[PDB]
Amino acid sequence: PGADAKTVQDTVTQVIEQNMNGIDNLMYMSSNSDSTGTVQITLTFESGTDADIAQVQVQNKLQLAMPLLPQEVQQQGVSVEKSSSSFLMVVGVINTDGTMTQEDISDYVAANMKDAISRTSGVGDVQLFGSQYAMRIWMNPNELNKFQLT
Amino acid sequence: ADIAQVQVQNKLQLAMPLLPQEVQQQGVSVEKSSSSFLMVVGVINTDGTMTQEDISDYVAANMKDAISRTSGVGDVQLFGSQYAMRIWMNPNELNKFQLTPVDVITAIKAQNAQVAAGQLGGTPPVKGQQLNASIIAQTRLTSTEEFGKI
Amino acid sequence: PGADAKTVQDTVTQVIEQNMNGIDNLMYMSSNSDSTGTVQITLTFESGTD
Amino acid sequence: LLKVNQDGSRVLLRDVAKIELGGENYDIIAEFNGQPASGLGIKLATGANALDTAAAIRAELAKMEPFFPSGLKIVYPYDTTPFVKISIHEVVKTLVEAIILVFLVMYLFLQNFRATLIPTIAVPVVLLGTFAVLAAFGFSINTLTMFGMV
Amino acid sequence: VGMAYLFVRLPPDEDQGVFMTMVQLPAGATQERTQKVLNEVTHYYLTKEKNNVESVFAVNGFGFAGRGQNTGIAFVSLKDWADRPGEENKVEAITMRATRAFSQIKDAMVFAFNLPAIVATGFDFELIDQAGLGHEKLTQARNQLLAEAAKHDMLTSVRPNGLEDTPQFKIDIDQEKAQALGVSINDINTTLGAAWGGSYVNDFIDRGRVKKVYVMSEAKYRMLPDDIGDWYVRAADGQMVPFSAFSSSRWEYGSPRLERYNGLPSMEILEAMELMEQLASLPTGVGYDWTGMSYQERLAPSLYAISLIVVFLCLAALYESWSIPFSVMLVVPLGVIGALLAATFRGLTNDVYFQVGLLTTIGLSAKNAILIVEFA
Amino acid sequence: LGAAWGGSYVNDFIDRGRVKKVYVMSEAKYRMLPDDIGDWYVRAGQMV
Amino acid sequence: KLPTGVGYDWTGMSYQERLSQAPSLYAISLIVVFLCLAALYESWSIPF
Amino acid sequence: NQLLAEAAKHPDMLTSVRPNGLEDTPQFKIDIDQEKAQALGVSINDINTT
């Protein structure tokens, strides 16, 4: 979080990507790194390889790189999924009455019905269109200057 | 061999917390192995321009990784080493200035960082926002002179 | 070592089981967090799973 | 509590900030026909079957629907499944029509009703045996197989 | 004779019942400058296409061409196929009428399209920086080949897949000034990072569920470069120090997305039979690499000539004449005109569906011929 | 002792677009005999 | 009739007992047996 | 506690419905005073690790 493309590439993408060697049945590899601060590395295996064994090998090579990533990447949590590419289906949750805003509905979905769908067999990746809650604290620079704090 | 490796791996991570220190720093690696080389690929320079280190660095930075990812190739071993930024201290030099290698390490680690520092215009924005730029704090050093000016 | 039920049950148990997604052939999940400081998560897979 | 003043005054965190239960990130928001909404972008694991995974999601969402707060319903925008069922169920129809047509077509050419009952029992037997052959060879029923049978 | 000419004149995307609409704005565009475009799109669909579109569900900030604050995407689901009769109410027409109705919007890139099934049928292309050049040398070589896209046909619209460079704010910190003032570089860095990017601290319990606790500066104080001057740092002696006392600032250019291919910096570039002359079109030290569909397709009659030779031997054994077989395999080009003519009358090209019914009918005309030339 | 006689990996740097390593280590002339142990002083403000 | 927000679920031994089909397994065994015997005796009503 | 002793009313269809789990027991709550600690000059980290 709070990192640009050059920082993200230098500190995460290359460090992860210099360890992806000696993986069976691999055709090519391609990665992105954008100013939101997110890395995305895709490794494409040949037609007819065993997907779960491919994931096991990729994970084995990744656990050699985790000690080298920054604490802020590790805390967030990296992930390795063998999902496809195109959305199988998208569900939506609206509020007919008009009691809740986007934040409330996103919190309800994330807190109560995102984990049970991610554990259903056959689901590789779940993208949530919104955000869950978090005790958010908004600092005030004038107050911090007034009380001699940081 | 795939099943053999899997059931060596998941038998190893029962005895991974017993290792004192090297549980981190890219330690325990489980991978299939042969014993003898398929092939050795030499690299020489006819016109006297490069030496041991220059040749081995070229083949470490520019063709090692591509070969390690070719189809059917297992464990590639290099007969040399990639470049590093070597710093040769001088005990009769830091004793005249009452310094220590700990001070050298700290100064280098503080003046050669990649710092991630947010962006201006970032969400959640205020009504009437027109900017979305990124902020660039300090970056890593790239050359011998920059390292010399620390 | 030291933690009770609540301390184990929300600094370890909830964190561990919020990361159990993307595992094939899973039937259900259960866990215990007892005052001796031990947590115990059990995953049951479909019959025939390797 | 942050700090204590000279006279004994106290500086609390609320004096210098603005605590609020917001989202983890604000980058992404969604709207469904104008009104606010959220949702899940379910992908599909490699090798999974797309029709009995959607059924599993739909049967999981039926389990957490009674406990929804007041007036919170789910809708199903983009969803690639019902087309598959309709198309397969489309090809099958034409196949069953063809048996009646031949039982009539041949009846038209041979006017005995007794003798027109043999091909009408011959064609379904081979049709049903083909499915069993596929279930022995490890295939599935799809657009290609149903068109191969028609 | 006629057949030959006919089988060289012919060259099935379903309506799937649903499609998407991708939006992307010039780099540096704020979130609501994108919400306005999304609102234009949803209003256009849910009014002008009132008879086809059932719901939209436009989501802002997400995109298949990466994430970001400018990008956006809008799903859209149509009414039942039996309720949208015609050729003008299919997806193949809705997502031409809309896309031709979406060049009106300025400073946007709005397309409505439809997916296939498996993996456009174009030529996906890469530009690997194999020497060690840098980003400008490749950016300079990316448009040098793009500008040489004159000529004329699978070429046409050939552009990049990344994002062009954007202004960035560089803030430069002087170590000697910081040390002289007594402030600590860790304090500088953590103040800047926490105030302008956010900082995950630890967890808290919210209705029995573990959630995060963030720290960030209120939006009012981190919007303009002039807001840098509101943030102070405690020095060692206990005094606040503004950032102007140990920093400069300047505006420079940087790139929003950086891409790599097989571990090397790259830039991707998204009648005919796939540009074979795309390769030889050359700067310092750059390479070529095809991927996706281009790499797959690259890497028919050989298995078709062996099927016509085995049927003659299969027939020869049946009849025992070494000339009788000829008759059986002489009505192969007779029952192949029915498909060709029909196909070259409606424009059905040469899909796997028409190429498989060919074989069915030349395998049934043989049935027809044999059961009589046997009796004969 | 470690950084003088064995070398220490400090962090990375960017060389021609590739991430390399950074090591500190003593010059070879002062890491050859046992007698060189008394060449290295460790700070207390005085060195010992 | 428990208070709102409280649900129930079967686990362990009762989970599989619910999810799966015994009469359908032998019902088809009866017709398969009948058909085999009708093929044997080359007649009907002999199986009965 | 409502579902138990609520189903017991049916001893002809259900027998020995037991809770299978430990019950609430006393615990020794101790709280450190942030205001008092800060004043005297003792840090919560050292209090906790003592």
Numbering used by the authors:
A (entry chain A): 50 to 199
B (entry chain C): 100 to 249
C (entry chain B): 50 to 99
D (entry chain A): 250 to 399
E (entry chain A): 550 to 560, 565 to 672, 677 to 709, 711 to 828, 839 to 849, 851 to 868, 873 to 949
F (entry chain C): 750 to 793, 796 to 799
G (entry chain B): 850 to 869, 872 to 899
H (entry chain B): 700 to 749
The authors write:
Here we use an alternative type of amphipol: a cycloalkane-modified amphiphile polymer (CyclAPol) to extract Escherichia coli AcrB directly from the membrane and demonstrate that the protein can be isolated in a one-step purification with the resultant cryoEM structure achieving 3.2 Å resolution. Using Escherichia coli AcrB, we demonstrate that these APol derivatives (henceforth distinguished as CyclAPols) are capable of solubilising the protein of interest directly from the membrane. AcrB is an ideal model protein for such studies as it has been widely characterised with high-resolution cryoEM structures being determined in SMA (3.2 Å),40 saposin (3.2 Å)51 and most recently in liposomes (3.9 Å). Here we have shown that a modified cycloalkane APol negates the need for initial detergent extraction whilst maintaining the applicability to high-resolution EM structures.
While minor modifications were made to optimise buffers for compatibility with the polymers, purification with CyclAPols resulted in clear elution fractions containing relatively pure AcrB protein consistent with a one-step purification. Initial 2D classes showed a clear AcrB trimer, with a good angular distribution within the data. The resultant 3D reconstruction, processed with C1 symmetry, achieved a final global resolution of 3.2 Å with clearly resolved density for the secondary structure and in most cases the side chains. The local resolution is lower for those helices on the surface of AcrB within the membrane domain, where density for the side chains could not be unambiguously resolved. The structure is asymmetric and exhibits a clear cavity at the interior of the trimer, which after model fitting was devoid of any density that could be assigned to lipids. At both contour levels, no density is present that could be assigned to the bound lipids. Comparison of the maps or overlay of the SMA and CyclAPol structures demonstrates no noticeable difference between structures and only minor variation in loop regions. There were also no identifiable lipids in the cryoEM structure of CyclAPol-purified AcrB, despite the clear evidence of co-purified lipids as observed by TLC experiments. Therefore, the apparent lack of lipids in the EM structure is likely due to their mobility which prevents them from being resolved. There is no noticeable change in structure compared to other amphipathic environments, although lipids are not currently visible, and this represents the joint highest resolution AcrB cryoEM structure.
